[PDB]
């Protein structure tokens, strides 16, 4: 598991990738095709919240659901 202490041990310029590395497989389970885009969207969130989402499945799911609805709305807006 990724912890606050582990994340702080990393070079600051690496911290988002450490999060993305752990977030992606879970998001890909939920959304196999679009996981890469969704992970990119969530990585904009603050690291503390991302750490919480990594260890709370309900929290991750609800943010992923939001990301998907925003992506779909944007698809209609670009159309």
């Amino acid at each position: 598991p990724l912890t606050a202490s582990m994340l702080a041990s990393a070079p600051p310029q690496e911290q988002k990738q450490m999060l993305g590395e752990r977030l992606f497989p879970l998001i890909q389970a939920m959304h196999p095709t679009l996981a890469g885009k969704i992970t990119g969207m969530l990585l904009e969130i603050d690291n503390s919240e991302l750490l919480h989402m990594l260890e709370s499945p309900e929290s991750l799911r609800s943010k992923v659901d939001e990301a998907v609805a925003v992506l779909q709305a944007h698809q209609a807006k670009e159309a």
Binding site: G36, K37, M41, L43
Partner: peptide
């Protein structure tokens, strides 16, 4: 949430 975000590529 920003739908223009850069796509993640996993290692």
């Amino acid at each position: 949430l920003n739908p223009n975000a850069k796509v993640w590529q996993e290692i």
